[PDB]
Amino acid sequence: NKAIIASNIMYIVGQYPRFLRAHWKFLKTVVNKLFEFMHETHDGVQDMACDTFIKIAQKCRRHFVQVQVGEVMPFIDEILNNINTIICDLQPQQVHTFYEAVGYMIGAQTDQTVQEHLIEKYMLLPNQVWDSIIQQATKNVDILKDPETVKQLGSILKTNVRACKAVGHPFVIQLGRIY
Amino acid sequence: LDMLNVYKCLSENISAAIQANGEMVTKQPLIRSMRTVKRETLKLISGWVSRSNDPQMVAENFVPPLLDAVLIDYQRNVPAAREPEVLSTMAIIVNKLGGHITAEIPQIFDAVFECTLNMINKDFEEYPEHRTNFFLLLQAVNSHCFPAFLAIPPAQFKLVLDSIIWAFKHTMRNVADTG
Numbered sequence: 001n002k003a004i005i006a007s008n009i010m011y012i013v014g015q016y017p018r019f020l021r022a023h024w025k026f027l028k029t030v031v032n033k034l035f036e037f038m039h040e041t042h043d044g045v046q047d048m049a050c051d052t053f054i055k056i057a058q059k060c061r062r063h064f065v066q067v068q069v070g071e072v073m074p075f076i077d078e079i080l081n082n083i084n085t086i087i088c089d090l091q092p093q094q095v096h097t098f099y100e101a102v103g104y105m106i107g108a109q110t111d112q113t114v115q116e117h118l119i120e121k122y123m124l125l126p127n128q129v130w131d132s133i134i135q136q137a138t139k140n141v142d143i144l145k146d147p148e149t150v151k152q153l154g155s156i157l158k159t160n161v162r163a164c165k166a167v168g169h170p171f172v173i174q175l176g177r178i179y
Numbered sequence: 180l181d182m183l184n185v186y187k188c189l190s191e192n193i194s195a196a197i198q199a200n201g202e203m204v205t206k207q208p209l210i211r212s213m214r215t216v217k218r219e220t221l222k223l224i225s226g227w228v229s230r231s232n233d234p235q236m237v238a239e240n241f242v243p244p245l246l247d248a249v250l251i252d253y254q255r256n257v258p259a260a261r262e263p264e265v266l267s268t269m270a271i272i273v274n275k276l277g278g279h280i281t282a283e284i285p286q287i288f289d290a291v292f293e294c295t296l297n298m299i300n301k302d303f304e305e306y307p308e309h310r311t312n313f314f315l316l317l318q319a320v321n322s323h324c325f326p327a328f329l330a331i332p333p334a335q336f337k338l339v340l341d342s343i344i345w346a347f348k349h350t351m352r353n354v355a356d357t358g
Contacts, residue, residue, distance in 0.1 A: 140278045141234070 003040075007048045010034070014052045017059035024068040027060060028075065038098075039089045050094050054101035064105040065118075076105050080121050092155055096162050099126075103166030115170055123163065123174050126156050130178060183248035186220045189213040190252045194260035202259045217262055221249075225268040228275050238279040242272070246286055254290040258298055263308035266291060270316040277323040284320055284327035291316070296342060303349055314346050314357045 013020070013030055020027040034056075037049035057064065064075045079086075079102060087095050099122075106122055109115040129152055137143050144150065160178075164171045193213050196204045204210055224245070231237050253265045269287065273280055295313050298306050317339070320327060328336055346358025 142278075 003042050003045055006037070007045070010037075010048060010052045014055045017056065020056065020060050021063060024063060025070070027056070027063060028068075030056065031075070035086050038086055041089075046090060046094060050090070050097045050101075054097055054104075057101040057104045061104045061108040065108040076102070076118065079105075080118070083125060092158075096155075096158055099159050100162035100166050103163045106163075107167050107170070116173055119167065119170065119173055122167075123160075126159050127177075130156055180244060182220060182223075183244055186217055187248050187252050189216050190256065190260075190262070193217075194256040197260045198257045205259075214262075218264055221262070221264045221268040224249075225271045228272050231275065234276050234279040238276050238283075242276070242280065242283065245269075246283075246290075250287060250290040254294055258306075261295075261298075261309070263306075263312050266295065266309070266312035266316045270312065270319045273316070273319040273323055281324040281326050284324055285330065288320070288327075288331075293338075296338075300345065303351070307351070310349070310351065310354050311357075314354060317342065317346075318357055 010030075010033075020030065031053070034049045034053045037045055040046060040049070064079070067074050083102075087098050090098065102122060106115065106118050109118055133143070133149050133153060136149075144153075160174070164175070167174075193205075193210055196210060205214070224241075228237055228241065249265055250269075253261050256262075269291070291313075295309060299310050299313065328339065331339075343358050347355045349355040349358070
């Protein structure tokens with residue numbers, strides 16, 4: 001029962017960004033609740049929690065990259081310094097939906113310099129796998145024939161596609177780095 | 180294939196001429212002409228593998244015929260008749276094929292290594308080109324096919340490492356530096 005209820009609560013709060021955009025503390029509490037639900041093993045809860053999070057990010061993108069009252073650091077920072085601890089229990093596709101969600105936040109930082117640093121760290125986790133697979137291919141190109149490494153190259157790319165859909169032009173700094 | 184046959188035909192014609200009348204014969208029309216077919220043959224072989232782009236296909240078709248045709252020929256040649264460019268031609272292919280040839284180092288090093296080493300282990304002067312090239316080869320193998328140095332027995336490996344000592348004791352700047 002609790003999961004069916006929690007989902008509806010999460011659906012309702014997802015439909016009223018106007019209210020979230022006026023009450024940071026609540027928005028904050030909501031996001032964190034979603035981050036917790038992201039380790040929930042009960043059926044569907046993790047799909048629910050991701051749908052809501054991308055939704056909210058899209059419509060409240062500005063509040064995550066600008067410092068709110070009662071804080072001394074933009075929420076994105078906490079989120080980026082913890083990506084792994086949050087998404088560790090998510091499935092491949094959900095991880096993509098999560099990356100797309102943060103991407104929208106990144107797209108809010110119009111300030112060149114800062115948006116660039118945000119982007120570099122945003123794509124840091126996926127980059128490690130990439131950089132790794134790449135150096136090994138520069139020793140033996142029979143590796144790009146390896147079932148597992150090819151499975152990864154796919155998921156890394158898929159992640160790169162979503163981030164780009166949300167970040168927009170500025171994402172060029174990334175594309176250029178691996179193009 | 181035929182080109183390798185004629186190469187080998189000439190290579191055996193030259194060595195005999197020398198074995199029968201000493202180095203001197205190299206200083207005359209016909210021999211110098213036969214040396215040319217060999218050298219250009221080697222230019223062609225190495226010149227292509229360099230710009231080739233399918234390592235395995237190259238290591239499984241165009242490399243095995245090199246063994247009997249060029250390597251074991253270089254082995255059976257009299258010291259004065261051996262082509263230094265054989266070693267450098269082989270060096271280039273190792274740089275290109277890399278891991279795809281790591282399994283043939285045994286077969287290769289047999290023919291050329293020890294027999295060439297005995298030409299350059301008396302002093303530090305004779306057979307200059309053979310010194311230079313030999314170590315470009317050894318550099319290459321060590322650089323792109325190190326695993327080979329483990330496959331072989333400790334007795335052979337030692338012989339290799341001490342050969343390096345020998346290199347950097349040279350007064351020819353290039354040979355000592357390669358070492």
